[PDB]
Amino acid sequence: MNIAELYGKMGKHSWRIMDAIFKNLWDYEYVPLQLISSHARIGEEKARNILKYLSDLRVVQNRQKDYEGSTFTFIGLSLYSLHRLVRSGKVDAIGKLMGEGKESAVFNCYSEKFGECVVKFHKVKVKEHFSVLAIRSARNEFRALQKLQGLAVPKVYAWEGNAVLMELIDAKELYRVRVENPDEVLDMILEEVAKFYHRGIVHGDLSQYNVLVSEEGIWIIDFPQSVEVGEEGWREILERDVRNIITYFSRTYRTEKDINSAIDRILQE
Template identity: 65%
Template sequence: DIAHLSEEKTKKILRDLGEKNLVINKYTEYEGSTFTFRGLSLYSLRRLVEKNEVEALGKKMGEGKESLIYNCISKYGEAVIKFHKLGYSSFKKVVDKRNYGNLNFSVLSIRSAKREFTTLRKLQGLAVPKAYAWEGNAVLMELIDARELFKVRVENPDELLDAIIEEVAKFYRRGVVHGDLSQHNILVGESFWIIDFPQSVEVGEEGWKELLERDVANVLRYFSRAYRIERDINSVIESIISDTGS
C-alpha cells in the first residue's frame, strides 16, 4: 500500500519508474509525477489482465497521432486493445470543445478512452465494433477483419453510401455524432463498420450539428471523388435529422 511508504521509499520508486520511462518526475516549484504514454498503457494493460479481460498481448496493428493498437487474446477470443494517447498538440480543438479542461496528458487520454468506450456501448448492435472493457487509456474491443474504405474498390458504391448515411442516421437517433468520420475510419469487408469514436459528441452538445455536417461532407466528398457519385449535402443532413425510424 503506497500510503504506508516513507517519503524516501516513494521517491526511490518514482526515480526507478522514471529511469524506465514509465513516469515523468518534475522538480520545479513543486514536486510531482505523471505517467508517460508507455507507463499509462502498461498500467491500463495490467488492470485488464488482473480483471481476466486479457490473456496475452500480440503484435502492433497500427499507430496514429491519437492511439496505438495491438491485437490480443482475451476472454472473448481474439480482440484488439486501443491505447489512447490524447495530447494537446494533436487534439487542441477537441480539448476546447469537449470540456476536457486544462488537464494533463494522462487525464486527457483516460477521458478519451472512456468517451470511446461509452459511445461504442451506446451504439452496440449497429455497425461498430463490440466494446468489451475499458481501463485507463485502454479500450478492449472486437477485432474487425476488414480494410479502410480508401484502400478498397467497392463494387456497389451507391448502395454502400446509402448504408453509411443510414448508419449515421441510426447514430443520430441514439444521440451520437461521430465527430471525425471519413474514409479512414470506415472499414469494408463482408459488411462495413465505423470505428474511432474518441471525438464523438452527444446530440445537443455544443457544436454537434457542425460536426454532423462535417462528417457527412467528408463522406460525400470521398464518394464524389472516388466514384463520381453526387448527393446534395443539405438533403442528406435533412434526411438524417428528420429520420425517426427505429
C-alpha cells in the same frame, strides 16, 4: 522495449506507486512524491527510488522545478491501464502492435473470455494534462460504443484508464479498397450515420480512415471525439461527418449525392 517485456519488469511495489499516481491525477498533473508515498504506503526514499527506475523505463516523467512530482508518460499510462485490464480478468496477454497514429496505439491481445481482440491506448473554455485528457478520450469511446451495440461497430468489452478493449474487426479501411458499388456503400454509411443519430450519438470524425469495408459489409470505428445529440455544436458536427464522407466519395468515385439533402434526410428521422 516491447510492452510485454516492460510489463514483466514491474513488481507489486511498482504497481502500487502507479496506482497512487493514477488516483491523484484528479487534482495534480504532477503528483507530489509525499502523496505518492502516503497513498501507496511506501516510505518516501523507497518511493523516490521506484519512481527513478520507472522514469528510466520511460513509464513516468519526474519533474523537480517547483516540487518533486511525477506523472505518467503515454507508455506508462497505457501499461497501467493494461494492468487494470489484466487484474480484472478481461485480458490475459498483450500481443503485437496492430497500428499507431496521432490519436492511439492499437494492440492485438488475447482474452479467454472475449477471444482474440484489440486494446486501443488513447493519446491526447480557453483555446490555446496528458493523462486526464487521454482517459476522457478512452471513456468517451467506450460509452459511445456501448450506446451503439447491435449496430455496425465493434463489440466493446472494457475500459480502464486510457485503454478500451474491443472486438477485432477483420476488414480494411475504406481508403485502401476500391469498391465497385460506391453509391450503395455511401448509402450504407449514411444509413449507419442515421442509426447513430437515432441512438443520440454523432461520430465526430467520420472519414475514409474509420469506415471499414469487406464483401460482408461496412463497420464504423474510432469514437473518441463522438458527441451526444444535444451537446454544443452536435448538429454542425453531424453535418460535417455527412459532408466529409460524401466529399470523399465524390472525389474518389464521382458519386453524385447532394450534401444538403442527405443531411436533411438524416435529420428528419
